[PDB]
Design an enzyme around this catalytic site. Structure first.
Site, PDB file in Angstrom:
ATOM      1  CE  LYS A   1      -6.145   3.097   7.706  1.00  0.00           C
ATOM      2  NZ  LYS A   1      -4.911   2.906   8.518  1.00  0.00           N
TER       3      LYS A   1
ATOM      4  CD  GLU B   1      -1.870   1.237   3.171  1.00  0.00           C
ATOM      5  OE1 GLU B   1      -3.110   1.147   3.265  1.00  0.00           O
ATOM      6  OE2 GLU B   1      -1.115   1.233   4.161  1.00  0.00           O
TER       7      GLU B   1
END
Lengths: 201, 201, 201, 201
Positions: free
Chosen positions: B127, B38
């Site tokens: 998240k 990421e």
């Protein structure tokens, strides 16, 4: 209803995978001295459980719904005779419905913004969900800006820190894991132990 | 994409002040066994990094954007071939864009109100930003009301508590400080150590 | 005002049940070296306190309001000469009013969603309310995604962890319990101790 | 005014080389419990200090002039709101002015001739200037011939002999060196210590 919490000081979070086990654990918690009962909608056919558990209301047990994330669940709860609407939500569409129907609704708040939004919505009692994450320091720190707000920190409560919450100044507590785990005899014994411990401090 | 997380179980948060260092650390984390990558938009010219790091996709590395607080960043990420849109946001204008373009979008939630808002928006994965502040108790306490929600607690994760998160029942983890600090050889060695430790427990 | 915080590095949260005690404790904190003063609206007749405490402004003391949960409190504060508007809110109707009137407004945020909402509203400084619950790890973890945001963690601060907040990179601190409890002489001595401790680290 | 001396039993002789330091030390002595304050004209722009220190009068602090060796200083003091006219003088032109304007005037006498001159002028309270030179024996020896005269021995007073003066039968005391030397926090602490010591004996 903003008065029975100061007396009973205990709310039972019953989470069962079956209807019969849910009834047998509600009876167990009641026989332990837990008058206030809350039925989570995660239990299969929670509306059926609430409707068929109406015999316990006569002996002095107040039962209500829990985890109401939709207005259809709220309507099924109120039509089933549930005297509480408990959600981790801060739903504006459910609080208005509860105010219109005149049923008690305690929302779950974790941040000061949610706290003030609920306060402006008209609620004074609040659910401190989660409880273990925020800790006993949250209520002590928040007593200053909003002394009128009374907290019910359901979640992460056991015999070790049950007295700390009341020392910090919470109106009532909600136990779902320590109270509602094990055999019905063990559940009743643990409910009695919780009641005695809270009466002690 | 709700399937590769269960397999790789690791997401790398690469935060570099230069493009070349970012590429050299992405290679380092990949060689350590970290397949999922990421790219944070805090890196200067993150879109350029994502576009020019397309050679790593062929060898089995899935790269995506991170910290997308605007729709222009989202469009620059999707046009650059990024397969993830990661934000600390709960932006309604970015989730809708990702749904329209059919790209994966995991939002960052810290409170039950944000959790239910994201759930109603259509997202199941979430998240847990921050992770160290909420602690491993948050996922355990929240498993009850919403068992279907899978959590990826990026932030505040090291070798000490990496197994505790998976014991509590998280789908994957995101490491940005322990994994992506030091020389590229050290970064690769630490990525390999993280992968081995997670495979152990 | 985004410059005096870096110098004084201390904000006093004065909470008194009487006007005279509030004035006597504001004098005490000032004589301890606490130049920045914040008056909580929980004090009875806080507007009167702010208006009649204007003599302290000439000697180099900056006084402001606190816990402003309504626009009427904001207008009473600005009309009373208060140079701060401090709320646990994230009110959009108060931030716009402060921007229109050109007065400083620091909102209280506890989650990344509130943080980004305030950032999009135009504020860079933020109030980390509560402080003890989030802990020093919150600012360290959040420094990454938003390095430009400066934090003032009011609440749950004492001599034990006062240096940890500044090591983590907070712009200023707000003490309301340790600083403003006890006799005025004790209050002044504790303010001096806090100032010396912060100057040390 | 022949009544507040019996209650407060302390007069503060503030001697500062700057106006701001004088104000900061007057606040310090007040917060220590020293209600009666006397401003010496040796301080630069003492009239300005007295005029701008009028905010302290509302909270219960009585401020007055000191060392008034001219009638122009007396007029500047009375026009500034000073409630005391204190001089080492035995000026006949200042006592008459104070009697005409109805303001309190205590003269400084060191010999029986000055004592009887002041008594014939109409004053009963007197300033025993100096105090350390005459010693506690002076008041004891002079109690005989003039029992009605009450003495305020300003000068040469500390914690060692503060109780001896009151045992000898003085109405009040004036401290200018021990009380008004050091940092404002130290000044307030010493004022509190003096007040407690006098309350003890």
């Amino acid at each position: 209803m903003e008065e029975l919490f100061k007396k009973h000081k205990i709310v039972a979070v019953l989470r069962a995978n079956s209807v019969e086990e849910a009834k047998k654990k509600a009876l167990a918690v009641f026989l332990g001295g837990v008058h206030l009962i809350e039925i989570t909608f995660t239990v299969p056919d929670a509306d059926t459980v609430i409707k068929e558990l109406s015999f316990l209301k006569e002996m002095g047990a107040i039962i209500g719904a829990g985890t109401v994330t939709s207005v259809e669940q709220c309507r099924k709860a109120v039509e089933s005779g549930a005297e509480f609407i408990v959600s981790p939500h801060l739903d504006e569409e459910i609080s208005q419905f509860c105010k219109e129907k005149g049923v008690f609704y305690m929302p779950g708040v974790m941040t000061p913004t949610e706290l003030v939004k609920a306060m402006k919505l008209g609620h004074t009692i609040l659910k401190l969900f989660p409880g273990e994450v925020v800790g006993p320091q949250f209520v002590k720190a928040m007593k200053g800006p909003f002394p009128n707000v009374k907290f019910v920190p359901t979640g992460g409560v056991n015999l070790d820190n049950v007295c700390e919450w009341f020392k910090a100044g919470v109106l009532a507590v909600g136990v779902g894991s320590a109270l509602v785990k094990g055999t019905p005899v063990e559940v009743a014994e643990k409910a009695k132990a919780f009641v005695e411990k809270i009466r002690g401090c």
